[PDB]
Amino acid sequence: APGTFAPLRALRNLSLAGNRLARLEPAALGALPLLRSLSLQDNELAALAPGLLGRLPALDALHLRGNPWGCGCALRPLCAWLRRHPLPASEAETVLCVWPGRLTLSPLTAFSDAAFSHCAQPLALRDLAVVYTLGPASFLVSLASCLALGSGLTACRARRRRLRTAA
Amino acid sequence: NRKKYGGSYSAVSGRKHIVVCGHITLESVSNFLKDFLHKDRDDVNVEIVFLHNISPNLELEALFKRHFTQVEFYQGSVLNPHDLARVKIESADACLILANKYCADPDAEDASNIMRVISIKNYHPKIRIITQMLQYHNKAHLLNIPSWNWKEGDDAICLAELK
Amino acid sequence: PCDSRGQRMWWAFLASSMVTFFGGLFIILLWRTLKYLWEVGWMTSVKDWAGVMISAQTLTGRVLVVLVFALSIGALVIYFIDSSNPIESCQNFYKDFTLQIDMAFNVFFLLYFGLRFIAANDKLWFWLEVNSVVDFFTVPPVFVSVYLNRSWLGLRFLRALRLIQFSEILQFLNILKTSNSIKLVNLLSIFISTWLTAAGFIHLVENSGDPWENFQNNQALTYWECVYLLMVTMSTVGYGDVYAKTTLGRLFMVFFILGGLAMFASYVPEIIELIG
Amino acid sequence: WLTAAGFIHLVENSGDPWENFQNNQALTYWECVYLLMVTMSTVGYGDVYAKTTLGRLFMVFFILGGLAMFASYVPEIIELIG
Ligand SMILES: [Mg+2]
């Protein structure tokens, strides 16, 4: 339940390992500024939702072995944490992808930003205008092109007819 | 419940348009259109505007569809001055009244035709009118209308006389 | 890679289509109000040329009409194929074969829309036709999709509404003349278009849960299951094995029963009688 | 009625081929007759229904031609008997 851990202002290490937690929400943890490490090993966490790790500034050590990590964009905020909090090699070798496919059982630390460039980047200010203007601009261009083609064809036909009426 | 063919014709500069009213039917309209738009005739752009109270059926709607740019239809009554203003009788080059050649009472059909021509003359006297008359005497009745003047062009085609 | 979606950005495509349609309306109404408050014509010449093109009055016109028929069927098939894919996905334009075909179809539909607009008598009442609307909510999203390398299966079901303008196509080509056959094609087109469009809308709203619940009401209904659900619904049978669970799906079902059960009950017996 | 019930029986007892016959429903012929009567009568209890893809497809295409047939035949038969 969200807010379960809220009153615990002085938490340092929280253990949730060996459980059947399918999904962990940002509101479940609450604000834990003093939380220094978290344990989530041997669980059913398919992926960490965005905004979960944003409320733990002091989270320096994290355990993620034996978890069904579906290596997609849903864990983009996760690996970005791992890049700035390197894991020990013994722990790193056990943290692997789980999804069948291109990324099966590949270490999470082996995925770089370029590997997930296709993922949803935050909204920009150029593309925001481009998507808004693409529709009407394309419709106007099509209308102008049709008008120009029709005008040219009609002028050509009229010129051919009046220059060659007697011919 | 709606009027799908209710609308006002728009006069086009440089293009003469004629109005056809009276006995409008699939066979009659098809014959008129194949005579009017024949290839052997000189290339003149004339817009046909049909005015009739009864809404066209699927066959007549399809026939108007084949002549998409050539013809137009507007559901209305010839008696109403508003309907006559909708089809632009004021700017029309001519008005043609078709007749039901095959009718129970030829005098009644002639009465309907003189109705229609009197209505057009009442709304606009200058307009030239081409009509069909089943009986010869009703043509003489047509001559009694004040605006029925032959000099500028005004034609009564008596089927009995010509036959 | 895989699993390319973690969030939702449907508002891009939706707002592109919406701004196209509403900007057209605003410009037309502003032109009307501005006019209210203040040879033979080359505009008339191009309008007449476009009117000849829209009809099958010339060989090139017949070719255009037959192409419109074929590409409407093709775009419907493309939507059917893409229905299996997830609601939102990331794909590459120059490495996938379906997006190129869809782009060609939409470019053709845009040019055809331009021709129809040139040929139109009243611009305002042309802007509010169903064909124009389905052109507004189908082509701009595909252009946005190719620009952003991100495909959202949104209002693509509206392509089924392009199936309505088929009796008129056959009437232009002189194929369809007698009143009974025109009535048959009209009834069949309207019935099948409404069926497939409602099924597509149900598929979209069920696979993408209602927004105020953070999209947590997914039912995972395939398109064929939604077609079957619509058939069972407007047929009044109502098995209950498949039904709409989201609030938006239930709302559309409530507002669609009123207009769809009557449509079924008046169209199916008439179609059967006319074929008989 | 009997032919449609038999087709449902065959299709449901033999699951769609592309699923390697993994969609058996094991309906008796009487259950299929009852289902067809409930369907083309527009009642639609939902306690018995077709689950295979082929069965659902046939049911969709049979609804159109069978509900009208029921609604046109049953009152006429009752009137003739009366
Ligand atoms: Mg016109």
Q: How is this structure best described in words?
A:
The structure is cut from a larger assembly and holds 1 copy of chain A (167 residues) and 3 copies of chain B. Chain A has helices at residues 26-29, 76-84, 89-94, 126-163; strands at 13-15, 37-39, 61-63. Chain A has 167 residues and is mostly helical. Chain B is 34% helix and 20% strand. Chain B has 6 helices and 6 strands. The longest helix of chain B is centred in the last third of the chain and has 18 residues, at 106-123. Chains in contact: A-C, B-C, C-D. It is classed as transport protein. The entry lists the keywords transport protein.
SSE layout:
The structure is cut from a larger assembly and holds 1 copy of chain A (167 residues) and 3 copies of chain B.
Chain A: E1 13-15, H1 26-29, E2 37-39, E3 61-63, H2 76-84, H3 89-94, H4 126-163
Parallel strand pairs in A: 1-2, 2-3
Chain B: E1 16-22, H1 26-36, E2 46-52, H2 58-66, E3 71-75, H3 81-86, E4 95-98, H4 106-123, E5 129-133, H5 136-143, E6 155-158, H6 159-162
Parallel strand pairs in B: 1-2, 1-4, 2-3, 4-5, 5-6
The structure holds magnesium ion.
Task: Looking at this protein, list some descriptive labels.
part of a larger assembly; 4 chains; A: 167 residues; mainly alpha; 4 helices; 5% strand; B: alpha/beta; 6-stranded parallel sheet; 6 helices; binds magnesium ion; Calcium-activated potassium channel subunit alpha-1 (chain C); ion transport (chain A); potassium channel regulator activity (chain A); membrane (chain A)
